Specification:
- This is part of a larger assembly, with 5 copies of chain A.
- Chain A has about 525 residues and is mainly beta.
- In chain A, about 5% of the residues lie in helices and about 30% in strands.
- Chain A has helices spanning about 35-40, 75-80, 260-265, 385-390, 445-450, and strands at about 1-5, 10, 15, 30-35, 45, 50-55, 60-65, 85, 90-95, 105-110, 130-135, 140-145, 160-170, 180-185, 190-195, 230-235, 245-250, 250-255, 265-270, 275, 280-285, 320-330, 335-345, 360, 370-380, 410-420, 435, 460-465, 470-475, 485, 495, 500-510.
- In chain A, a hairpin with a 5-residue loop joins strand 20 (about 275) and strand 21.
- Chains in contact: A-B, A-D, B-C, B-D, B-E, C-D, C-E.
- The interface between A and B is large, with 52 and 39 residues.
- Chain B: Keywords: Host cytoplasm, Virion.
- Chain B: It is found in: Host cytoplasm; Virion.
- Chain B: One of its GO terms (cellular component) is virion component.
Amino acid sequence: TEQVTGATGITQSTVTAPLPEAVSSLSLAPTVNALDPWVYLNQTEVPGGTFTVSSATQPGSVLLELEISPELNLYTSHLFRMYAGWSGGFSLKLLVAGNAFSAGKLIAAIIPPNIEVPNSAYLLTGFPHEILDFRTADSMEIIAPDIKNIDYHFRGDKLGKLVVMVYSPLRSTSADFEIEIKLTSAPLPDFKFTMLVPPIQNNALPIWSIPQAPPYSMVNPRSPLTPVVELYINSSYATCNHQLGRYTIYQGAIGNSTFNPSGAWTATCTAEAGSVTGHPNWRYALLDLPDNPTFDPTLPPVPRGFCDWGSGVKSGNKQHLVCFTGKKVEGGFQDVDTHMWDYGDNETVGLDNTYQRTIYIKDPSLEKDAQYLVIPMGVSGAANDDTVQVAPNCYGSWDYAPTVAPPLGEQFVWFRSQLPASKTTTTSGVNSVPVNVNALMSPDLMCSAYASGFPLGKVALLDYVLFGGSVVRQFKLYPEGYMTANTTGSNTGFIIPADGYFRFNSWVSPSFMISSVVDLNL
Amino acid sequence: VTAPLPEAVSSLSLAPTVNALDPWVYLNQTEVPGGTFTVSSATQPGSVLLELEISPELNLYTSHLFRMYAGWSGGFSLKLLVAGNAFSAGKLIAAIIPPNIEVPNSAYLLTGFPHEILDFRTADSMEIIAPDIKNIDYHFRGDKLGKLVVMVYSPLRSTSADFEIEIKLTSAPLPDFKFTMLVPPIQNNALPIWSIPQAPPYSMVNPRSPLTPVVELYINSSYATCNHQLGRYTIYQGAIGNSTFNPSGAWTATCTAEAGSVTGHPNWRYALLDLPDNPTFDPTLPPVPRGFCDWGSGVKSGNKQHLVCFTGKKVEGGFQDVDTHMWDYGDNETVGLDNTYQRTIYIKDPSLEKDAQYLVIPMGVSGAANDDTVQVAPNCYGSWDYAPTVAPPLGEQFVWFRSQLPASKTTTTSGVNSVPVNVNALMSPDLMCSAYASGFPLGKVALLDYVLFGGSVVRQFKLYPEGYMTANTTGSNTGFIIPADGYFRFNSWVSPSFMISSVVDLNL
Amino acid sequence: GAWTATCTAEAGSVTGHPNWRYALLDLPDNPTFDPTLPPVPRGFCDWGSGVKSGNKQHLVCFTGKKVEGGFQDVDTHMWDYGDNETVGLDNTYQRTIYIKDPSLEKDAQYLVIPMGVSGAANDDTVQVAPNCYGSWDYAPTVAPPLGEQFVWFRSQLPASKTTTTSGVNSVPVNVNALMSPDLMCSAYASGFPLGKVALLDYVLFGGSVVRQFKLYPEGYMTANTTGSNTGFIIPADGYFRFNSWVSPSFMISSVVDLNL
Amino acid sequence: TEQVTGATGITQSTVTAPLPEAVSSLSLAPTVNALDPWVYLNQTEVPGGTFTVSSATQPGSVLLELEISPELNLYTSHLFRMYAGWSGGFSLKLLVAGNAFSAGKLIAAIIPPNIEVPNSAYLLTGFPHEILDFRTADSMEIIAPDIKNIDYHFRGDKLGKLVVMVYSPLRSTSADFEIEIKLTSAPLPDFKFTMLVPPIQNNALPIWSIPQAPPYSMVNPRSPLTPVVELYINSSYATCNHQLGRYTIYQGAIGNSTFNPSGAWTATCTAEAGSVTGHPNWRYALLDLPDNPTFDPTLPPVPRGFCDWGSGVKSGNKQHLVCFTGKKVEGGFQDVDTHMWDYGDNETVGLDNTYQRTIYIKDPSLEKDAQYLVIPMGVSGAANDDTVQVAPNCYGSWDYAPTVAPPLGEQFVWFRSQLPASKTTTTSGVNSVPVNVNALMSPDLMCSAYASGFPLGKVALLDYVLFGGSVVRQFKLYPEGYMTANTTGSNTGFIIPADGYFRFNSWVSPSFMISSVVDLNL
Amino acid sequence: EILDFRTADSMEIIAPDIKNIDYHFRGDKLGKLVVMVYSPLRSTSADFEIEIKLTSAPLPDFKFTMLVPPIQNNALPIWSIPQAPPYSMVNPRSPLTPVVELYINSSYATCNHQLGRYTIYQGAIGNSTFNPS
């Protein structure tokens, strides 16, 4: 069908099925559960279906990739949580923003299941497909068939994918009119469910309901016992090699990450003899691991969720970590006092800043092979926020969290925590300096995330309401744990408030660029 | 096509009295109150531009009749007008929202609802019938209502025009639409038409600076946000904070004046404001007397910043030897007290009597204080529902009621010399007059025409329910002025997101 | 806003009791002294304390020499209207006014804050506004229809006496205003039916006690009163509410006993 | 109906009647005079029907306002002069300039009679109406009905109005393409006249024929006996408070304005005793008013059309007015001689510069209560063109002409007159200085205006032909008397020639802005 | 409907059941019947209170539904008081002393007692108890 615009211009509401539909008989299905007709009639936006194509996007890179599955339409996905088996295709719609002054083509091809998706103008046309002009636009209705060899799917079956790619780049220099694409779908008339079953499955919940709580209520994994004073963003902090604050939906807490940071914040050491030749006698001590009684590489080499300060790579007499320390005694501990301690030993690499039992202790009179408390508390010496930020190098094979960096153009938003500075009037020899701690992610959000497991291949785009809805920033939360925001400026000290009320916006693809922009320089 | 969901004529048999309407009301078409919004490339995707409800408010004729009637039924034939251009890129999807049903943030989900779409480029408006979804034979007053939600089916990719598009909605009750239960024409619902009496702003009063006529209107980018108390008013909540409908009466005040001296620098003496309105210093009622003062000259300036005041010892019959005296708020040397809202204040008089009421007339300001300093109202923190600090939506600036404050100098050694300054009042009770007279449609903004030269020049301002007016400004300047000729006039109801078509060049 | 005012303060000497000097009110609203526009600045004052009292009756005022930026030495000063010794000028509306200050500069603007009264002046004396005659369509004098009395907005004016020899001491008195702009607010908002008087109910004790008043289009409010008293007062609790449109001849069913 | 443009673009010739037509039976009409069919077929431009809408015009302000009456179409109006009663509607056409690159809507609503016309996008849609797009344009044919409660109108009946307003503002930044709107009309087939009557009525003549005469032939009311040396324009001369040169079509000559300025230029005074304390003894004198023998406020306080120089507000020994003066004697006057005279007295305000009998006279030996001639002649002292321009302040209740200022953007064009300077070689004590006089309007034009009374609510747009048609300026003549031109520059000394040949262009609304522009700076 | 005091004949006004719903449950919002003095007693020659009684009867269409056991929290239309002399009643202020008589005193303008106070809705108020003894 075709229609003219308000005046001039021409827009086509194309409908076609690039690949024929082979409706299954559902004979093997024990019971073919029907479905509400108004669901077929109604259309919904596919998760991650909103991809924007500008004149800068390279031609050939795929912008959208959807598995033909009940997850496409919200209603069908929610029902699929009720049922067990599903069948039938989907009527996907491509809503395009056509102006008749733009110039370019997009191509939508249905990739069969178990077939790799290529990304190039060439080499992608082979698949059954359709080409949409940007000047025509308006709702190319793709009848995405249900490519099947079994009569109806069970959970986990590999599924065909619809992929949209820039067929011909946008070039019309009408002053950078980007084209936004919305994709919607709904079950085809042939779609049917089967085998009703209690509604608890592995489905990612179609909408993840964010508990309306503020960040300052959240705990700081790297700095428990310290409220999250504000959310924070820095350009310099490219990567994050932390092991205490790191959680993911799939693998759970990683490395030293724990869901009770305050609970595990404490640790103990055996205080083995010997010391390095530093001006203050730094007696060695080995952290005792309740979970690793038999020291082996596959488990962590330090107590779960112990410490992540990692002040200096070669910190000698300039930087230190300060901690309460007391000798274990009947009941509790003996005269617990603050002391300047360090990871491993400065004298040797691989131990200067790593994760191992061996650690410096300021206490000159540290008893040989006596259990000693250690509370990392804070930092002293010449440390600063960035020196704290760099976590110690973790090595071995103890499933430690790999260091990660945000996608180009985005930056890691952190849960900034203000660390009080403890200073002694008497000559205890130790004076913690004011410092701050940044946490990649807090377990509180991750709890609701685990409840509403992310849909595979999608990314939680959470918009952060700050001033009662007047100001709404947008942070992209990745399933790996880190949260990122699209930033244009280049500043290290830019701040975000801690008003709260995180809310779920929609499911977007990792490549998706946040429409909202945070000017760090501003 | 035109009707995504066919209307279900209700038999109304349950209605005690079927109140028909003039057929010509159905025949005629007209724009709807508040059904005006601006869509622009700067708009955020997935953000509902506008939300309505199938209700007699859609048609102004139907609303006017609704003031007479208690019950009503039927949908609304709605026609959507687009101020589009050829360069425009995008489509609009309007999805009728049955009551109790939530609205998805995505157009791909809005498509499921009974909807209908046009193109920005096409000129002929599209007609969408928005049926009334009823679970009862007819609809009483105050019940939940199905919503009409307009969403940009496609945002502005080309954006070659780079100027927003105006949308206006027209509605018509369906032939099946019927009223019932005739009642006296007095309803809490907002009147479709707001009639603003012609009163020049100078004819209005300045809450911040009584006794000084509003000399002009002011615009300033520097004054990004408003934290004032006296000026603020609200259509719904009435007066907020210290603000009162009589700034003149509340201007006077007094303090018990306990015999105490300043601690950091004992050149001043401490006095506590009595609270006739608040019998006891409660954390919920205002800490300062109703409508007293919000100069906030000093932030930490113990001496350089000072407020003037006519002060006198209280005696039988009246006060004593009322003389100018310079004063401050709380403890200048104290954090949380140098500039806050509480009883303690500075007093210049070296001699202050132990617990004697002193007249307090804030009068004016002294020292190095300036307009910028006074514009910053004292920071007040507590649990007495202080008036919240507000700022205009991005792209719009506050318009204030500028007032001129005369200076006062003394040759004799009274030690007080009031520096000349200006004052800015957020809103006027004289405009709240007609505001309260005619209610605001919920979640809608009044668009006011301000006429200066007998109609030759008009400035359009948005007046929000919160009580603050804004103007679209392309430029950025600090000292921009607007005359006080007057003749405020109501234009239309617009959504808060609406952008004023007219623009004001501040750099001019 | 109109309360403040200024006078050119020309070099004129008082007659009768010396030590006072004449001053002319400047007319920012009225550029030039005209027989049609008001002779005094808009909304200046109408105290009219004295009728022929050269010294017994007087008005207080905060006055200061006008200079760049602002006024100078704003101090209380005793003042009056026109020529207290002159018939047709003692109590009228003309730029000429008494000034207590012995030192008045030749043609310098002075701040004029009418503030309050002084001397023998009392509430009755202030209640009599100065007689104004001319062609400037001054507000006509009005009286209530027989059997009804005006209801006024009483206000309290604090006194002020000085220990230092400033020579000015304000006597405490009250003030009565015929109508309030805060009520004319809604009056203008909703016009009056032609030739009809609004009958409004005034509620004092949360509805326990009500008082019916008529609000005439001329601005004055009246109440039917069987008794006759001078000092009768009514609480200011509030809650004015419109009852019904009535003809001017209407007699309020409710009655207020003044002797009570 | 619809039609495409030369290529692309789309234009609609809409026809519709927003309000139904109720044709009267004309039963009560004694005789229903028919009307020439070709008049119905033919279309004409309505007076004031050419209103231009640009992207700067505020949305909401009404641009056009036409009473549905025979005055709309020229032919019908001229016939209506022949007849007595009229009936029937009109087919109004909206000719729009649509480009398909513009963007905006205008709204035309038929206001019923005796109903106030509002001006706002909202609050105006209630009336029966139609919305025209600027991209479609081309002749929306509005069938303006004849809203009647009487079967056929008599003269003076209130009539419904068609009002056109900016429904949606023009914004298309195609480099300031303003849109010009022409409105034309013609009687509907039902239109009929009745009761033929001799053709002399109160109708404004449909076209006002300007007598082809030059300004220098015109007289200068403020300075008779002095030819109008040129037409003149000044930025500084904002308002005009003159009482000698002021005429209007409706109320006739106002204040001291007279149709024989030269005839009344003379006056006489009684020369009452007393003088002010100025260095030269300025004897007082009271002007005798033939029309005001009993001095009363309602009539003027000075002789009709006496004097308007008004040199100085506080002119003492620096400025004066000079006039021939002679003592009345048997026959004529005794030794009439020039003398420096003044309005009222400098010593007092309200008399310094006002209109009253009392006036200064230079003559030291001015006889008490002796009639004396006064001929204002010219000016002396330190006067200049602008000091002369300011007329004296007029006060009282003698129906004096109110001071007026032009609409914003326009300026008062004047009839500049060059005043010869009389200088005495002998010590007569008086020396007139060269000066000029500006006149708001001359009675000569107003004579033809009275003949062709202006249509109510319209303004005479007269184009001034100067160089034989090569140069044609445009001056808007308001019925109040003043003539104005749209000026862009800001200069006080800009001049217009006195070639002549004023010609009538068309009837425009007061809000109308002259298309032609005069650059004062140029 | 409007009635005049002077007339003795009763005026019948039908009080319709305004329903936005098929039928009412217990506790729903209901249309109110309001009686107001249309014109005041300006004459006041009587100066005595005029008593008003209201009588009602269900309209023919009036109908019930959903039979249920007869127990509801609503107040009974008729209140039955056992015949008990006040001296047979107990005095909270002074137990052990029978209520000798009922007392009126103009001087006792207001009551500030705690023990005596009782409330139908709130039961005992302040120190008051159902067993003063």
